[PDB]
XYZ file of C-alpha atoms in Angstrom:
90
model
C 82.079 39.828 74.519
C 79.511 41.421 76.117
C 78.767 45.716 75.002
C 80.747 46.493 78.513
C 83.920 44.345 76.777
C 83.199 45.948 73.651
C 82.354 49.678 74.176
C 85.652 50.360 73.746
C 87.284 48.131 72.117
C 84.713 48.880 69.160
C 86.130 52.400 68.036
C 89.289 50.956 67.964
C 88.706 47.524 66.198
C 87.283 49.469 63.248
C 88.832 52.764 61.299
C 88.249 55.992 61.482
C 86.401 56.308 57.951
C 84.696 53.053 59.373
C 82.900 55.116 62.296
C 82.523 58.707 60.139
C 80.817 56.101 57.988
C 78.753 54.267 59.722
C 77.307 57.662 61.598
C 75.316 58.715 58.014
C 73.037 56.306 58.636
C 72.883 57.007 62.489
C 72.376 60.487 61.951
C 68.911 59.917 59.393
C 67.887 57.481 61.639
C 68.276 59.872 65.200
C 64.872 59.352 66.832
C 65.429 61.431 69.879
C 67.379 63.763 67.058
C 70.390 63.578 69.657
C 72.605 61.021 69.686
C 70.109 58.702 69.840
C 68.788 55.912 67.834
C 66.200 53.578 67.936
C 67.146 49.836 68.650
C 65.932 47.822 66.014
C 66.987 51.086 64.263
C 71.047 50.609 64.301
C 69.513 46.667 62.935
C 68.263 48.265 60.326
C 71.762 50.502 59.227
C 73.345 46.733 59.338
C 71.166 46.022 55.564
C 71.160 49.777 54.736
C 74.986 49.597 54.796
C 75.569 46.197 53.354
C 76.274 44.304 56.421
C 74.394 41.221 57.511
C 73.364 40.227 60.748
C 72.787 36.597 62.190
C 68.765 36.461 63.148
C 70.187 36.567 66.683
C 72.104 39.450 66.929
C 68.353 41.596 65.966
C 67.119 40.568 69.034
C 70.361 40.474 70.921
C 71.326 43.946 71.144
C 67.803 45.025 71.427
C 67.827 43.696 74.761
C 71.362 44.015 75.701
C 71.354 47.864 74.680
C 67.997 48.142 76.639
C 69.262 47.257 80.000
C 72.058 50.189 79.793
C 70.110 52.597 77.423
C 66.924 54.470 78.166
C 64.439 53.494 75.534
C 66.971 54.379 73.219
C 70.278 53.329 71.953
C 73.568 55.621 72.238
C 76.605 56.151 68.684
C 78.167 53.773 70.941
C 76.646 51.116 71.349
C 75.378 51.544 67.481
C 79.064 51.689 66.833
C 79.989 48.439 69.088
C 77.242 46.839 67.275
C 78.904 47.043 64.109
C 82.097 45.728 65.899
C 80.301 42.835 66.962
C 79.106 41.985 63.579
C 82.276 42.350 61.988
C 83.791 39.787 64.687
C 81.079 37.292 63.490
C 80.224 37.790 59.856
C 83.765 36.221 58.461
């Protein structure tokens, strides 16, 4: 599904500790320093946390989030992306 479907469900698909875990990588990559990181930054969050996305997801996330984003990607979108991976991954 698209971000529109995944946005609310994402936080429910994962456990609270997963959300808290991912927040660590988001916090360091916060480019605006407020709730917003770079689009490629979230893609890198995967690597640093041992998550391996498909080659298409890397570019996918950037453009999909860019439509709703304002030059950056929100914490929600960053969280949603993880979930999108967890679905395709294994």
